[model samples]
Target: RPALDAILEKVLEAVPFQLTMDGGPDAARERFRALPRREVHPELRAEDRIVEGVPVRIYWPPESSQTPPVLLFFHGGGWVVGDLDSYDGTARAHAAGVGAVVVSVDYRLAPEHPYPAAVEDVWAVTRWVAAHAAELGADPARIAVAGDSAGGNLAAVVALLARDAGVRLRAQLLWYPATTWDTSLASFTENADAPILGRRAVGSFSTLYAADIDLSDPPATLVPARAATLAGVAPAYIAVAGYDPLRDDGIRYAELLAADGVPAQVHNADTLVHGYLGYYGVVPAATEAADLALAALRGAL
Candidate 1:
């Protein structure tokens, strides 16, 4: 593998995997909140509300004559940690970067709500977005979904669900998403000891996410790659971290989508590690990579 980015070298020193792993979900949440977050964009307006029983933070771009497109975003936390507050910077950056209204979903986490709960909540919020587009002052026909990690997994599943429900999504942006629970993928073993997310951490989240559900035949929402076909889902822009165990998961999903004739593009941030999106403002590489993805999503929309 190529050398790690010099900036990320310092990032790893500050955040060791043990902080979140050893302390449990609550500890993880606290530590996640303590990280350096992106500053709020002054040009955007943000508001929080409960939609379809899910708490969501909406970031609206500066006023415009044309109705803005909507991006329904989910935050990554392996479905066990992470909240809207922790992902505020990402949501804000998307709104300012893509010039689209971003609805960041705060779905319930696992081990408390478990499998399908977060999925159902995201689906519900999406449906509400489609139905209330006029009220949101956004374009109903130009909706999209985007997320990182577990949120990326949700974005993928929601894209499929949107297809079946006839919601008409224009794109799906996924950042280092966990596309499957299968640990035998090449990257899992190749980067078994990746700095931020190793094999054991991956397995820990998997077990906590769906303790009783058989991963051997997991649902498409939890493991989007398990879907029978990727035919009509929205076009995708999947970003993979070369040093992350889940690297192959995103790459593999992109291949699966292409195999079924869906337009899928994969961007490898080969020098970065997992959770790079969280370092947006502080890390130059992270900022550039995220900006490029946001640009692609903007074009797709």
Candidate 2:
């Protein structure tokens, strides 16, 4: 657990408040919007534009074939905070490391757009990329979905919808996903006071998102765990943090995938806390874990 304990030692100092605790939702969002963002491997090429009527930022490495595989990504901010600029560094790192096209989705956030809106927007963009992969010089046959935290929730839902719609995907990559909306899981209570994301933040994050919609409504598909079966979904790379409230959610979802014959690898960062992916530059174990995930995606693609 050295990798984990070492990282937790720094996480608390680096991230003291859970944004939501600072002010109102709007204030938390502004704080998130203004958060310092880092750059990784500056030489990587990137482009931003609208696709399927949603804003998206795409990253490309220095070298690639005419039709490269793509990692269609979503940012994790509990569906309340993150935007393209905030996650640019992570997207670029994935692009450079995986040697594939990385498209970061700016799906509509909650309280403003709310539940089904973000899910719908993400699925729209995924289908857009899958059908028009060539438009971005990406291969339709190698398109994969990736996201972290709340975005991971979005990715998981999209995978289910994609299977139903027959929109083929090569793989899925999730990080500390909030697969279920409930807080009854033991990890939530065990890591209730865990740094980065605490017990109070857990309830608030989801309620803020599905404000107008019922938590278990079928239309919104708010809970990925509620998916009848994960049987035919794409292979996945799911990462869980030992000290995270949502750890069990991510690991359990992976177990669901495996039980139904879906290929998946559930990685537990035993000594690390939630949202470690955001600290890629400051944490050694996080950086290595991310690099390994990217390698897995590259190999899968």
Candidate 3:
């Protein structure tokens, strides 16, 4: 492991300096959008649908059997960036790897729609997906919610809302999810210089997403840690990147879930940094992380 770390360190150092420049989240997302979509293994079928007047893309595996488990996925952009196209690869991989229907929501971005708007959109789409599961060839009883980064935050929130609203969720897959607005954690300070996501970058995202909203209220749009109870909710598989600013958030959430008697599993990708999931095509560690996620999903279903 030490030898591998040295090699990765050397490789990262040899890479162009431009790669490390902090292109704000929006710029990073734009660059991601400019890249051509990768070929996905599972045959994916997409459709344009509306949930509470918000547009969404429902992607399902073409080879799936009847009444497949539905996974409502929210793309991460810190509420300022990201969309269905930006997350197409991840969504496709989830649908293909997990043998489940992946419904990607296009919730209004932050700084434009702000707090509660994105969460509300997530809830609405979740309800819409659950209510119309039959038409989409989904099993309402075996639905799950998932996402990365800010999207993961939304997924967690949706699970909470579902629990409160008497909605049933089989599981939740959270990839390095941000569970709090508090920036004083040791991980945040330790990984403040980590690539992909840093203190300044995440701060900017939170500022946009929490625009004009109290950061410490119920539903705690900016922090899932504030939730009153995690008990009796869906089982969860939370993944944390080794060098991410939000690594502790995932750990803390898993601990909280366990304390509340919820079935939770934590998988730490000890060899990667934040946003590695987006590099599954080029990174072996990312592929392994994807496999772990799929395994968890399979067990949950």
Candidate 4:
């Protein structure tokens, strides 16, 4: 774990932390927020817009003739941090890898927006994109929701909401998602001191994200693992970080999906810790796992 632990400094370094360098509360918010994102893929045309009062960037493949499948992507920053700019490269990877119209959403963050706010923004943007698929040259029937960590939480919940709202999804791509807040899992205690994220960090972040919402009876979006059935949900590609405390949350989701007859693929990035996706530019394994997940999405869509 020491060699792997040594790699943490570089991974942490990759984050655009200069933006978060200011002092106090304002500085903290500034530090955590990534300026509105961009089109990181050469072949994709990125447009920045304000949709129904929510900020977003839509990535369109220039060569598409038929409608492209849409992947609504959310960024991870413990629900209190992160922004489209930070996840720009991530959305580009999905756009190029899966050949889908990737919509990067800038939903309201926590401790300010709180629970259901981000969830509502995600769901609203999803419905708007579906209803206006033609605007983005996206295939309405092939829409998907995706995110990492907190975004993963949003993506999973969106799948359920989309289903109940009569919007079907072709697939979902979740990268090292924080599926549940349960701290009793062995992974949680074992990785309580893991790099990038830890047990106390998880608890603190989850608390901020949930605000006053009771953890005991959380909504499915906050804890997808609590959803009654994983049976009819969209096909899923659940990526797990081997040393991440949230590993079992993703693993458990995969198990439940399989048990309920949903075709689910679980890929564990065995030597990695949480937030590896953002370090793809520096880590070989990170890029490989990320591309694999996107390839799976390409096939599903």
Specify the highest-TM-score model's number.
Answer: 1
Model 3: CA > 4 A from native? 1-29, 35-37, 62-66, 216-218
- lDDT of every predicted structure (CA atoms): 0.87, 0.82, 0.78, 0.79
Distance (Å) between predicted and true CA of 211, model 3?
3.0
TM-score of each: 0.96, 0.93, 0.89, 0.89
**Could you give me the TM-score of model 4 versus the true structure?**
0.89
Which segments of model 2 are wrong by more than 4 Å?
1-4, 19-22, 212-220
- The per-residue C-alpha lDDT of model 2 at residue 195 equals 75
lDDT of 2 by residue, 1-301 (tens): 3444665486657756464635776788777767555668789888988997999998886674556788889898988888888788888888887778888999998778887789888988988888887777777888788889999999888888889999887788998888877688878898898877888888887888886666555442688777778888889999889889999889888888898999999888878888887778777887877778889988888
Candidate 4 structure quality by residue, lDDT tens digits, 8-82: 456555552321212533556665544333335655688899888889998875565666788899888778777
Give residue 297's lDDT in candidate 1 (0 to 100): 87
What is candidate 3's TM-score against the reference? Answer: 0.89
Cα RMSD for candidate 2?
2.0
Can you write out model 1's per-residue Cα lDDT over 1-301, one digit (the tens) per residue? 8888989888778765432456778887777777766676856788989998899999997777878999999999878888888788888888977878889999989888999899999999999999897688898888999989888989999999999999999999999998877688999998898887888888888778878887778778878999999899999999999889999999999999999999999999999989888778787998999999999988987
Residue pairs in clash, model 3: 79-110
User: How far off is residue 273 in model 3, in Å?
Assistant: 1.4
Top-scoring candidate (lDDT):
1
- The residue pairs that clash in candidate 2, if any, are 4-271
Put down candidate 3 lDDT per residue, 1-301, tens digits, no spaces: 2122343355446541111214665665676566544466545787888867878888777563456788999888677877887688888888877778888998988666788788888899899888888688877888999989889899888888898888899999998888766688777898887766787777877777775666658454557778777797789999888778888889988998999999999998877777666766556667888788888897787
Lowest lDDT sum, 10 consecutive residues, model 2, at 211-220
